[PDB]
Symmetry: C3
Subunit: 310 residues, 3 copies
Amino acid sequence: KKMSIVLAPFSGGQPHSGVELGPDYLLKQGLQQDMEKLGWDTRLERVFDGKVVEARKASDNGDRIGRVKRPRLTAECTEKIYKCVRRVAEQGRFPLTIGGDHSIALGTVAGVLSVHPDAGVIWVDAHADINTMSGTVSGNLHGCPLSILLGLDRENIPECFSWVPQVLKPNKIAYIGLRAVDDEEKKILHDLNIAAFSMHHVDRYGIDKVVSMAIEAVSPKGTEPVMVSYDVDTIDPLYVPATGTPVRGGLSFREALFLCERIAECGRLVALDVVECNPLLAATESHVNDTISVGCAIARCMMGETLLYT
Amino acid sequence: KKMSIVLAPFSGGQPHSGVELGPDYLLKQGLQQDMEKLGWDTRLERVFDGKVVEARKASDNGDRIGRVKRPRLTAECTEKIYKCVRRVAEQGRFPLTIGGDHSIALGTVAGVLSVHPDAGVIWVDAHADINTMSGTVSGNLHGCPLSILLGLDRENIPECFSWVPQVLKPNKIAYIGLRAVDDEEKKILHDLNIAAFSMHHVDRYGIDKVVSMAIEAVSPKGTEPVMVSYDVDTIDPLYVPATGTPVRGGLSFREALFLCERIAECGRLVALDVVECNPLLAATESHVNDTISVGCAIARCMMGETLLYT
Amino acid sequence: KKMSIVLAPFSGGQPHSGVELGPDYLLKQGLQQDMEKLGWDTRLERVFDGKVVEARKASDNGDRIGRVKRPRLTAECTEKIYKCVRRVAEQGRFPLTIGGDHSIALGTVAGVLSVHPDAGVIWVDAHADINTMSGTVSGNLHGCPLSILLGLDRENIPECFSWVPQVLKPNKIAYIGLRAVDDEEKKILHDLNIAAFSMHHVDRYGIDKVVSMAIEAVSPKGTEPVMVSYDVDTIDPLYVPATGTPVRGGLSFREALFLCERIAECGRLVALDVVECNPLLAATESHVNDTISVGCAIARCMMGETLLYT
Ligand SMILES: N=C(NO)NCC[C@H](N)C(=O)O
Ligand SMILES: N=C(NO)NCC[C@H](N)C(=O)O
Ligand SMILES: N=C(NO)NCC[C@H](N)C(=O)O
Ligand SMILES: [Mn+2]
Ligand SMILES: [Mn+2]
Ligand SMILES: [Mn+2]
Ligand SMILES: [Mn+2]
Ligand SMILES: [Mn+2]
Ligand SMILES: [Mn+2]
């Protein structure tokens, strides 16, 4: 029962700065102590200096390839994350990555599928993060990771991303909590027949059924390893206010956590990313505390924490 | 695919002024652009000058018939709405009416049932709005429309309402989200055996089942046209604060919208009223924005807007 | 149809003062008028002077037996409550007790099971309140009542509690809404196989199923009398802010009340405690009003109040 808590304080995949503070905030909230308390032999893994990267992002506004903003910087860092996560798994340890915007998952998923190529992927998010380099309207790379992992729009993808291994198929990715999908993404998900459960399915079937369906969609043989990339903005902003791109009509705090327990209960989770926590994007001390403690809550629940006897 | 957005800035059916501003606010929120974006060939239909009517209401406190307040004024305006909506339907266009307090539905429903006499009616509301002229304690006519449409207490109903055609039967009206019913109304609904789904059924069966049940109750042959008069105060005030008579324990924002999609999904909606939006009844700019954007949201969702590919 | 509204303004079972104001606040909110309106022939029953007891608690910091704080004082008062409730039932009247912290339930449950020894007990709470005298970390007796009623840790229980009759078995107590259980309590509930439904079951099955399950667990023959000790802190603090130990992820206002109706609908409720309302533990006038009116709401709903015709 060994765990490596991968710190990924990156913010180049999007406009607002502050999300790179996630790792620190989470850790000071007692994340590592919590994993220990859950019986996890933990050790931190730093991939790069958070402030050094902020400097390179704040200045170099010349790092672009079309509407895509900061592709080189995002490629460099996500590659270091990929390599890091890859080793962590080769060592037979569970990698829990703390972001940082969601573009880090390009490194995480790439790293996990490198050791567990048959792993399914549950993308808990309000967004589909599948925009292509050519299609991305905003150009914020945190909304493009999946397109890159899937190898879509191969032609218009640059050199700085050639390091990205092609190991993720459409039938191994399942969304949950979607409600802010771009027209381009709606078509893509439909073209590729990606299993996506929007808030509509949650309202229709309740979180339980959805989770069940989500897990089945990426787990054919019922034995496959499961990975969850958890974007906190999936949860209604009235619970998670400190986040870059909030959208109303999100999961309730109870659903956000129940979802984790169902997964833990699955007994096949091999990795977890907890992203989009931006402390500087709050109004009070409770805005940040509620947000960060929610992050730690997803971690404890995913890692086995239950409300009753265990 | 033709639509007429009927503007009904009336506030005589109740105490608070400001609800007649609904139409304008909605429209500036981009309501018509939204219907266009949904592929609806739209055109506005003005029934009367909003400020002119406010003047006649503010002054003439002598317009009463018992406890009933402003019956003449309400009759005059709701008649113009009736006629308007009637023509809009005769033209084969979908009428989307924006209020204005709920007393306008006397004109809307009367207008719709004039062209589609077999249309069922789903009343999404926290209130039953079925009080009689004689029974109404408050005297606020926005809580009496259904009694008039149903022809109840025929004897004590005045001359100014003789224009109201009798075309609505008890078996063609179904409530959803009820939680603030008057004793008089509880008896009536029971006497007439009106299908009413209070918050109790939502909590008990969940919004999906309720919607299904609500649609079946007014649609025997499974082919009948469906009309929905949507009172925004059905939604919990923590979502829709700017409304005249809010009651706690309402539908969540997610339920409010999911309900619409289920209906749209029904493929038989022939008309829709979106009422009780009172901008001046807020505390902040978000109170109004949240309320008005919620109004536009019900419109988009009812008219086909989905979270995923369509 | 006779009812005795037992006033129990006690606060010795916990740190914060103000919760003894519950009874008064509730009553001024019209609690008794409400029970009358529901057709209940009511009469108040005062057990002791609320301010006199506050004086004895504020001063005597020497009243302890280990980590347990104020055992003598709690024993004296809960005994008076026991006796009171016992008589109220012997008189064939329904006892509705208003607290006051949850340690009063030692008197209430003891009183009810004295006249209805086969009565099941539904503990609506975020906490299990089953800590032992020896195990209690906090020492706040409001989290120990059930251990005393169950006769657990008999050896380390003091003289001042010998008056407590042993009439409650593990198979006659069922929790609902649990989410803040201590490690000690988790073991106990598991050892004794106590039917406990945490927020996890609510999220998983919805409030309806849970209530059904909760009622079945304590009602084998399907004829047994039912008692509910209702801790308002079971409801999410965003609904019930004025309470001593709030925990996020609670029941929604709708669930809090729906739960009551299901019970009322059961037709076998023989007693009800409504506890933990601390007016002085608010920030605004709405904090207190919302809290206290919620208390009265649970009362009306439990006692038969429905949203539709009855
Ligand atoms: N934060 C996210 N996703 O996680 N926002 C993505 C927003 C938008 N879809 C884009 O392409 O930029
Ligand atoms: N706003 C509404 N209904 O839509 N309130 C109705 C209130 C009350 N039932 C009455 O007769 O006036
Ligand atoms: N308010 C309550 N329960 O109702 N809190 C109990 C807290 C804690 N379990 C204890 O032993 O003190
Ligand atoms: Mn994301
Ligand atoms: Mn997102
Ligand atoms: Mn209405
Ligand atoms: Mn209403
Ligand atoms: Mn308690
Ligand atoms: Mn409690």
